[PDB]
């Protein structure tokens, strides 16, 4: 949910993308500039939904 | 026969040769005015 | 035979005639507009892109605080006040299309301040 | 028959193999998306 | 009348200011001309 | 030893194996032709020349065979759509058959010329070493070409001793193979006049025969033989390529803009016909004529031949499509089945509205309806919040004349809009999307592909010319340079 | 390192040079200036004057719409101006 | 010997600005092209052509000025000063955008002449012509983009107009209409130009910081032997550096330099082919598998679908004043727009 | 998903064929005596 | 099927990387 | 070498190898057709481009039968 | 040395030098046009 | 017809792969000096 409006943008191969379209999506806008380390989420499921991987990367 | 655009073609075909002319004229001339060896 | 073999890793002298190089290039344009100093050549070779990209990076870092590009929208106007378009305006339309369509559902208000 | 005297041997060094493959593979990573379209 | 007489460094700083002047006239023209917006 | 990209230099002066090579290539190009044919014959559907002609089926080779006469199949059918015709031996099957054999023979020939590479004919009596007198060769070959060029125009295109060529009216409705009489007048230089294709080959053929002889007799002025490093085959190449890519940039232009050589009934419409509403005007012209002779709107439009209406559909515009949108035009919008009919839109007041058509440039375009004076009267809104022209608020309706939907009218907004949404592409048709499992995304016609392919190859060949040419004028400095330090001081 | 031409450096310094160009340069300048300031340029290039894009009322553009009768069409566009 | 060899003699004479046979073609054109631009940029307008002010005389600045293309009515007409259009008249020619085909066609020959020059000068000086091979790349770009492209479209009107801003719209257009950024060939293009500007920078620095000391000064520039001899920088040290920081490193200056010719020339060649295809509109616009899933399933969203919507907006909001000859009228209600904006 | 059927084989042969080419050479080079 | 093809090529490029860095032809000086 | 029937019969056609005409041979005569061809192309080009119109020659799908 | 004046270099230099100043003059004048 | 989608690629790689194998060897054998 890149834009923080609960409208998930899937950007990975296994979820319908190809090399050209696929991408790692930016952290949520709900998050803004806040630090979002994995240990800041109730779960990974929550972390992958708010674009946690983006920051770690 | 010889329509307006046909006349223009000549005008450009003639105005073209002239340019090639004066150019090779001037050139061939100045060329033959120095080159000693 | 591959023209490449004509070079051995760990050579003492040079593998090309930098004087013949300069000789040709100096004649293409004109002598003083050509390098003969390999060191000055290579400095330029590095200086140019690095300096240019430095500015491009400062551009994105600068437009990160909303100091954007030149805005010549409706600059040239005629004797009555009518707006005479320039290519700068045709560019604005293409920009509006992008503005007006990006992030469909994310905006709730008039001005895009974010 | 006479052993034709116009032949030379052919060569491809290891580095060229690598440079080659790097090109083939990435082109493939670049065009596969459009092949599957 | 040849052979350098007018000192180069002066030919430059003079031809130089001379350009900052014309190129500067252009920049002024940007807030007044037709390229204005007013 | 040799870098991979030079392995073929092993022939630069082995006339024997050079011919062995060139023989194998011809074999493959001939072979390809034969089998590309069979592939089309195994998949081309002759069931309908009106709405499903070769150019809708991604046929590429089949058209070039009709342009010169071959228009039938041993199985009975024929390109024009006739029956009972007897193509004889020269049917598409025949042509395909022929090439496959010519290929097998050129193969065997390539083998023989490879093993017997050292024939004396390639050794110069004087130097006793391999050599080919290019200048005389060129003269000979050029003689044969013009001799053949001549014959082609003289006997084939004229019908004297041959079929003729494809000729059609101004709106690809009548096309066929017909004998064409020469044309030396001025209008014979008009790309769209068949007579010019005949005259050309007869004249150019002769000029070609003369010029050949010249070159078979007169020798090359020393000055030139030196300048153009003749007697160095790798220069014959640099020049040929320059010619080959010139030929290419030209065929690409005549395919895209159209000419008596790339007829629409064989390669498809032009992007330019759609641009200038070419066929739209021919239809109207006809419809208004029928109304003059006191016919009804139904009768007028019903008179309009399906084939004609079909050319007035943006889905046959070669300018629509994509680079990786593969296949025939049918994998796109589907196999055309029938013309639904002319759609006339009107609004509550009876006023007749008009659908703004889709310019080739646009992948997607909006539905806007205006009257004769171009005033926007109705449209399909994005943000309904403040729509003033919704089909609903305007009572827009649609009526059809001639075709499947002839005589019918539709008034429920959705259905009206559906058709309005279609009007955008020109004449509305009925497609069979099942069969080919179409996706509904426009693909380009053979006219389009041939054009793309040749424009690229040409532009690519330019580079070859510049490369080989350079490599001919600088053979000496190849491998590197050497000594002195002269530069500035003549 | 040399050719026939007289080393720019020498020329850009020769009082003769300036004696010539102090006249020539401003000459060319004042000429072009007048080219614009006399309105001549506008006619040499058919370029509209601030008061010649549209007719008083019209807000439409004088778009040339057909090649061959273009020049003719352009002339008529000048007709509405005034 | 004879007038020809005397004509030659003169031309191939080593002056300040080498003329040569080639010059007979280069200079006439090259100057006319540059001249016509500089002329239009300041004097000719694009009103009768695009309904646009395009010269200093009208108020445009160095960014907004330009020599705009001819009307769409002209089609692909060569628009000769004395042709059916202008009819010998000069001012009309100017107003019908005759100056475009002028700059275009002239500059075109000028690029031929120039490459020939390289070829001619190379030969004289006795060096290999790899400077000419290289320059094929820029020719291809100019040829495919300023000629082949519009030759495939409706007319010269859709070719890039000569000017700074007037080129940016050419860019925006291609995104919006051809979705050019998604094209395999444009990508290769950039990989080459971007990758070429890397070799440039990287090689330069590798040399300047891998130099031997041949002087006692800090400003090591003077310490260079214009007259060959030893390598001025440690090719052996450079090899070890990169071999330890990047893992891979050159070790054959002959190859390292050929590579530098290849990368950016190949890149531009590819970017050309992509455009030669955009001429026929045979673009790389969409991915069918993506569109099909987006149709049936409303919750599927990729950065790709997102982009396509940006294109729709570009096309809808630009088309009107960008294609005047189409007398487009798009009611406010038909204009695609997100919420609020 | 809804991809092209030939995409797989087009990509496979696009990688294999030329790679197999290079490899044939490199190995035949590599094994040349001296 | 597509995913597999994309990952495979990627996996192949990384393999190449390895061999290129660790199995290059040792770069020899002078003698050659 | 290896002579052959066909080989001998064709032996003449390929033998005058380096044989060149002297000086500027036919060059000038050639430089004229060359210039003629150049003008010929410009014409047919300009005709296709409708820059050179000629009543009688109508460069469209029309003028067809 | 005894350098000449009118040379090939001179011609070129002026073909660009002369027009330029003429334009810089033209443009400098435009800065005052208005409405 | 109604065949297997992978049949084509299964047959292609089944022929290519081992053929490419043999060929790599034969050529590297063939080019071994003396
Ligand atoms: C290294 C490279 C060095 C390059 C050096 C280049 C030097 C000079 C280049 C000259 C270019 C001339 C271009 C001429 C042209 O565009 O001429 C165009 C005209 C055709 O013109 C078009 O015709 C169109 C309309 O066709 C329609 O309307 C017509 C009647 O008007 C007929 O009815 C026709 O059948 C129907 O389809 C429209 O009127 C267009 O506006 C009009 O421009 O003739 C023709 O092209 C004849 C064309 C021969 C073309 C050779 C093309 C080479 C590459 C092409 C790539 C295409 C993509
Ligand atoms: C030379 C021109 C040429 C042209 C114009 C055509 C045109 C056409 N063919 Mg044909 N064909 C050709 C040669 C050609 N073919 C050859 C040599 C073969 C033998 C393999 C075939 C075999 C063939 C078959 C089997 C079929 C066709 C079909 C068709 C139609 C296909 C529509 C399509 O999907 O295109 C698609 C166009 C492309 C995918 C081109 C994209 C090329 C890109 C992806 C790669 C370029 C390579 C590389 C990556 C570049 C990198 C370089 C590096 C230095 C950077 C079309 C009219 C079809 C048909 O008849 O349908 C009804 C059909 O079934 N063709
Ligand atoms: C039209 C005829 C033609 C002919 C007879 C040649 C012949 C030759 N070229 Mg040349 N070339 C041509 C056109 C032609 N070229 C064009 C149009 C270009 C511009 C792209 C080039 C660019 C070019 C370069 C840059 C070089 C040559 C070189 C050579 C020599 C290479 C020796 C070799 O082992 O090849 C080796 C070929 C291969 C190992 C395989 C290439 C595999 C890929 C790229 C393509 C596979 C294509 C496919 C099977 C079918 C293509 C069909 C075609 C119509 C598109 C050879 C004498 C080389 C040279 O001068 O060496 C001294 C060299 O460096 N050429
Ligand atoms: C768009 C950016 C770009 C520009 C402006 C540019 C410019 C130039 N490159 C040259 C050379 C080169 N460029 C090369 C590789 C490359 N060049 C690249 C990109 C560029 N190269 C790239 C990406 C590559 C990698 C392949 C090489 C290998 C060379 C050379 O050897 C050559 C050189 O000598 O280096 C300095 C110079 C050739 C001079 C000439 O031929 O005059 C003759 C033609 C003239 C004078 C005018 C006619 C040209 C017409 C078409 C232009 C009209 C343009 C208007 C006047 C202005 C337009 C306004 C714009 C805003 C659109 C020239 C200054
Ligand atoms: C603390 C809690 C942490 C929870 C994490 C949960 C992750 C869940 C992912 C998920 O549910 O995916 C569900 C998805 C999607 O699966 C796809 O869904 C699509 C519709 O959304 C379609 O139906 C596709 O056809 C379907 O394949 O994932 C997978 O199929 C994943 C296979 C994943 C293999 C992962 C390997 C990771 C390896 C790591 C290191 C290897 C060495
Ligand atoms: C002599 C040999 C010359 C050889 C090659 C010359 C190439 C010349 C390019 C000239 C561009 C001139 C632009 C100009 O004059 O603009 C004149 C304009 C117009 O400015 C506008 O004029 C209008 C009236 O005409 C109105 O007054 C507007 O309000 C005003 O803004 O330019 C500027 O204001 C320009 C600031 C430009 C800064 C440019 C840097 C360019 C660097 C180019 C290459 C660098 C290396
Ligand atoms: C005297 C009269 C002689 C008449 C002969 C007629 C033969 C007709 C064959 C026919 O109609 O087939 C019709 C068929 C069947 O075509 C198939 O029909 C099936 C249903 O029956 C399905 O619809 C298949 O999808 C469809 O492909 O033939 C072809 O498609 C044939 C392509 C044939 C290519 C033949 C090449 C022969 C080459 C010979 C030497 C080459 C070198
Ligand atoms: C500088 C660089 C310059 C590069 C220039 C590059 C290319 C110029 C290309 C011109 C191409 C003309 C291509 C026609 C293709 C075609 O018709 O395909 C036709 C096919 C068939 O496509 C199918 O057709 C069916 C009806 O018959 C249906 O329409 C199907 O839906 C459709 O998918 O499509 C494709 O092949 C796409 C192929 C992508 C292939 C990549 C192949 C790589 C092969 C490598 C080695 C092979 C060894 C054997
Ligand atoms: C071309 C060129 C160049 C150029 C340059 C220039 C152009 C310069 C200029 C300069 C200048 C132009 C300068 C100036 C300076 C100044 C100063 C340093 C000043 C000071 C001042 C003061 C201190 C003041 C004061 C005052 C007053 C006046 C008034 C009252 C008050 C007061 C007191 C405040 C160069 C060399 C680079 C190089 C080569 C080329
Ligand atoms: C021996 C013999 C025989 C037989 C024969 C045969 C049977 C043959 C065949 C043949 C064949 C069967 C052939 C084929 C060929 C083919 C070809 C030649 C192909 C080609 C291809 C290509 C070239 C491709 C490419 C491409 C691609 C893939 C993609 C992109 C684009 C392009 C196009 C580039 C007989 C009985 C007569 C007798 C005598 C002997
Ligand atoms: C120098 C190199 C020149 C290359 C081509 C030159 C072509 C000249 O072409 C010729 O130009 C003159 C104007 O100067 C035209 O003369 C025409 O334009 C002027 C305005 O300029 C009108 O006032 C005049 O009534 C009209 O006939 C000729 O009709 C045209 O045929
Ligand atoms: C040594 C050859 N001369 C030479 N000169 C120049 N001059 C410019 C201005 C392009 C940097 N460049 C090069 S290539 C980096 N070479
Ligand atoms: Mn991603 Ca910068 Mn348009 Mn507010 Mn959001
Ligand atoms: Ca006023
Ligand atoms: Cl969103
Ligand atoms: Fe270097």
PDB file of C-alpha atoms and ligand atoms in Angstrom, chain F residues 191-192 245-246 248-254 256-259 270-273 275-276 278 451 455 459 462, chain G residues 67, chain H residues 72-78 105 108-109 112 139-140 143 147-156 276 279-280, chain K residues 44-45 47-50 58-62, ligand 1:
ATOM      1  CA  UNK F 191       4.180   5.491 -58.898  1.00  0.00           C
ATOM      2  CA  UNK F 192       0.473   4.591 -59.090  1.00  0.00           C
ATOM      3  CA  UNK F 245      20.406  -0.491 -48.765  1.00  0.00           C
ATOM      4  CA  UNK F 246      19.387   2.186 -51.260  1.00  0.00           C
ATOM      5  CA  UNK F 248      15.795  -1.154 -49.389  1.00  0.00           C
ATOM      6  CA  UNK F 249      14.997   2.357 -48.163  1.00  0.00           C
ATOM      7  CA  UNK F 250      13.004   2.685 -51.393  1.00  0.00           C
ATOM      8  CA  UNK F 251      10.893  -0.496 -51.187  1.00  0.00           C
ATOM      9  CA  UNK F 252      10.114   0.494 -47.589  1.00  0.00           C
ATOM     10  CA  UNK F 253       8.810   3.836 -48.822  1.00  0.00           C
ATOM     11  CA  UNK F 254       6.650   2.474 -51.610  1.00  0.00           C
ATOM     12  CA  UNK F 256       4.190   2.485 -46.657  1.00  0.00           C
ATOM     13  CA  UNK F 257       2.907   5.162 -49.045  1.00  0.00           C
ATOM     14  CA  UNK F 258       1.540   2.742 -51.620  1.00  0.00           C
ATOM     15  CA  UNK F 259       2.121   2.252 -55.346  1.00  0.00           C
ATOM     16  CA  UNK F 270      -2.513   2.653 -46.045  1.00  0.00           C
ATOM     17  CA  UNK F 271      -2.265   4.671 -42.866  1.00  0.00           C
ATOM     18  CA  UNK F 272      -2.737   7.657 -45.137  1.00  0.00           C
ATOM     19  CA  UNK F 273      -6.047   6.538 -46.577  1.00  0.00           C
ATOM     20  CA  UNK F 275      -5.836   9.896 -42.369  1.00  0.00           C
ATOM     21  CA  UNK F 276      -7.507  11.633 -45.303  1.00  0.00           C
ATOM     22  CA  UNK F 278     -10.093   8.297 -48.243  1.00  0.00           C
ATOM     23  CA  UNK F 451       7.955  -1.773 -43.973  1.00  0.00           C
ATOM     24  CA  UNK F 455      13.539   0.226 -42.940  1.00  0.00           C
ATOM     25  CA  UNK F 459      19.570   1.561 -41.844  1.00  0.00           C
ATOM     26  CA  UNK F 462      24.300   1.632 -44.111  1.00  0.00           C
TER      27      UNK F 462
ATOM     28  CA  UNK G  67      -0.337  22.622 -48.939  1.00  0.00           C
TER      29      UNK G  67
ATOM     30  CA  UNK H  72       0.427  19.163 -41.245  1.00  0.00           C
ATOM     31  CA  UNK H  73      -1.204  20.293 -44.511  1.00  0.00           C
ATOM     32  CA  UNK H  74       2.229  20.370 -46.138  1.00  0.00           C
ATOM     33  CA  UNK H  75       2.492  16.635 -45.532  1.00  0.00           C
ATOM     34  CA  UNK H  76       5.970  15.361 -46.371  1.00  0.00           C
ATOM     35  CA  UNK H  77       6.583  18.169 -48.897  1.00  0.00           C
ATOM     36  CA  UNK H  78      10.241  19.115 -49.242  1.00  0.00           C
ATOM     37  CA  UNK H 105      17.970  18.596 -45.295  1.00  0.00           C
ATOM     38  CA  UNK H 108      21.675  16.177 -43.180  1.00  0.00           C
ATOM     39  CA  UNK H 109      24.157  16.621 -46.002  1.00  0.00           C
ATOM     40  CA  UNK H 112      27.540  13.295 -44.631  1.00  0.00           C
ATOM     41  CA  UNK H 139      24.073   9.885 -38.194  1.00  0.00           C
ATOM     42  CA  UNK H 140      21.650   7.018 -37.513  1.00  0.00           C
ATOM     43  CA  UNK H 143      18.423  10.133 -39.853  1.00  0.00           C
ATOM     44  CA  UNK H 147      13.732  11.991 -41.223  1.00  0.00           C
ATOM     45  CA  UNK H 148      12.651   8.342 -41.067  1.00  0.00           C
ATOM     46  CA  UNK H 149      10.282   8.954 -38.162  1.00  0.00           C
ATOM     47  CA  UNK H 150       8.102  11.737 -39.546  1.00  0.00           C
ATOM     48  CA  UNK H 151       8.317   9.995 -42.926  1.00  0.00           C
ATOM     49  CA  UNK H 152       6.239   7.239 -41.374  1.00  0.00           C
ATOM     50  CA  UNK H 153       3.778   9.620 -39.743  1.00  0.00           C
ATOM     51  CA  UNK H 154       1.296  11.955 -41.370  1.00  0.00           C
ATOM     52  CA  UNK H 155       3.936  14.620 -42.134  1.00  0.00           C
ATOM     53  CA  UNK H 156       6.986  16.669 -41.097  1.00  0.00           C
ATOM     54  CA  UNK H 276      12.466   3.359 -36.895  1.00  0.00           C
ATOM     55  CA  UNK H 279       7.562   5.532 -37.329  1.00  0.00           C
ATOM     56  CA  UNK H 280       5.019   2.841 -38.231  1.00  0.00           C
TER      57      UNK H 280
ATOM     58  CA  UNK K  44      11.009  11.195 -59.965  1.00  0.00           C
ATOM     59  CA  UNK K  45      11.554  11.999 -56.288  1.00  0.00           C
ATOM     60  CA  UNK K  47       7.147  13.980 -58.538  1.00  0.00           C
ATOM     61  CA  UNK K  48       6.297  11.440 -55.840  1.00  0.00           C
ATOM     62  CA  UNK K  49       6.576  14.208 -53.263  1.00  0.00           C
ATOM     63  CA  UNK K  50       4.115  16.343 -55.269  1.00  0.00           C
ATOM     64  CA  UNK K  58      -1.839  12.352 -60.909  1.00  0.00           C
ATOM     65  CA  UNK K  59       0.111  10.824 -58.040  1.00  0.00           C
ATOM     66  CA  UNK K  60      -2.754   9.095 -56.191  1.00  0.00           C
ATOM     67  CA  UNK K  61      -4.540   5.770 -56.003  1.00  0.00           C
ATOM     68  CA  UNK K  62      -6.716   7.415 -58.629  1.00  0.00           C
TER      69      UNK K  62
HETATM   70  C1  LIG N   1      22.768   7.673 -44.203  1.00  0.00           C
HETATM   71  C2  LIG N   1      21.444   8.295 -44.647  1.00  0.00           C
HETATM   72  C3  LIG N   1      21.697   9.484 -45.575  1.00  0.00           C
HETATM   73  C4  LIG N   1      20.347  10.050 -46.013  1.00  0.00           C
HETATM   74  C5  LIG N   1      20.474  11.221 -46.990  1.00  0.00           C
HETATM   75  C6  LIG N   1      19.054  11.626 -47.385  1.00  0.00           C
HETATM   76  C7  LIG N   1      19.098  12.734 -48.435  1.00  0.00           C
HETATM   77  C8  LIG N   1      17.679  13.155 -48.968  1.00  0.00           C
HETATM   78  C9  LIG N   1      16.489  12.481 -48.296  1.00  0.00           C
HETATM   79  C10 LIG N   1      15.242  12.880 -49.081  1.00  0.00           C
HETATM   80  C11 LIG N   1      14.056  12.394 -48.542  1.00  0.00           C
HETATM   81  C12 LIG N   1      12.769  12.600 -49.362  1.00  0.00           C
HETATM   82  C13 LIG N   1      11.503  12.115 -48.645  1.00  0.00           C
HETATM   83  C14 LIG N   1      10.331  12.209 -49.660  1.00  0.00           C
HETATM   84  C15 LIG N   1       9.093  11.852 -49.135  1.00  0.00           C
HETATM   85  O1  LIG N   1       8.961  11.552 -47.961  1.00  0.00           O
HETATM   86  O2  LIG N   1       8.033  11.793 -49.992  1.00  0.00           O
HETATM   87  C16 LIG N   1       6.671  11.408 -49.562  1.00  0.00           C
HETATM   88  C17 LIG N   1       5.747  11.184 -50.824  1.00  0.00           C
HETATM   89  C18 LIG N   1       4.473  10.476 -50.269  1.00  0.00           C
HETATM   90  O3  LIG N   1       3.914  11.551 -49.518  1.00  0.00           O
HETATM   91  C19 LIG N   1       2.749  11.325 -48.707  1.00  0.00           C
HETATM   92  O4  LIG N   1       1.499  10.950 -49.426  1.00  0.00           O
HETATM   93  C20 LIG N   1       0.420  10.799 -48.408  1.00  0.00           C
HETATM   94  C21 LIG N   1      -0.939  10.431 -48.982  1.00  0.00           C
HETATM   95  O5  LIG N   1      -1.058   9.192 -49.642  1.00  0.00           O
HETATM   96  C22 LIG N   1      -2.479   9.122 -49.998  1.00  0.00           C
HETATM   97  O6  LIG N   1      -2.905  10.261 -50.841  1.00  0.00           O
HETATM   98  C23 LIG N   1      -2.223  10.297 -52.134  1.00  0.00           C
HETATM   99  C24 LIG N   1      -2.692  11.508 -52.949  1.00  0.00           C
HETATM  100  O7  LIG N   1      -2.386  12.723 -52.263  1.00  0.00           O
HETATM  101  C25 LIG N   1      -2.550   9.025 -52.900  1.00  0.00           C
HETATM  102  O8  LIG N   1      -3.976   8.922 -53.087  1.00  0.00           O
HETATM  103  C26 LIG N   1      -2.056   7.825 -52.078  1.00  0.00           C
HETATM  104  O9  LIG N   1      -2.319   6.617 -52.781  1.00  0.00           O
HETATM  105  C27 LIG N   1      -2.785   7.815 -50.712  1.00  0.00           C
HETATM  106  O10 LIG N   1      -2.363   6.713 -49.891  1.00  0.00           O
HETATM  107  C28 LIG N   1       0.121  12.178 -47.785  1.00  0.00           C
HETATM  108  O11 LIG N   1      -0.281  13.122 -48.797  1.00  0.00           O
HETATM  109  C29 LIG N   1       1.356  12.680 -47.105  1.00  0.00           C
HETATM  110  O12 LIG N   1       1.104  13.962 -46.531  1.00  0.00           O
HETATM  111  C30 LIG N   1       2.528  12.722 -48.086  1.00  0.00           C
HETATM  112  O13 LIG N   1       3.694  13.176 -47.407  1.00  0.00           O
HETATM  113  O14 LIG N   1       6.562  10.402 -51.881  1.00  0.00           O
HETATM  114  C31 LIG N   1       7.597   9.542 -51.529  1.00  0.00           C
HETATM  115  O15 LIG N   1       7.822   9.383 -50.359  1.00  0.00           O
HETATM  116  C32 LIG N   1       8.514   8.836 -52.465  1.00  0.00           C
HETATM  117  C33 LIG N   1       9.439   8.183 -51.435  1.00  0.00           C
HETATM  118  C34 LIG N   1      10.702   7.451 -51.763  1.00  0.00           C
HETATM  119  C35 LIG N   1      11.008   7.181 -50.305  1.00  0.00           C
HETATM  120  C36 LIG N   1      12.321   6.603 -49.903  1.00  0.00           C
HETATM  121  C37 LIG N   1      12.072   6.443 -48.406  1.00  0.00           C
HETATM  122  C38 LIG N   1      13.294   5.990 -47.606  1.00  0.00           C
HETATM  123  C39 LIG N   1      12.929   5.670 -46.130  1.00  0.00           C
HETATM  124  C40 LIG N   1      11.417   5.762 -45.804  1.00  0.00           C
HETATM  125  C41 LIG N   1      10.922   5.405 -44.389  1.00  0.00           C
HETATM  126  C42 LIG N   1       9.392   5.514 -44.275  1.00  0.00           C
HETATM  127  C43 LIG N   1       8.976   5.128 -42.855  1.00  0.00           C
END
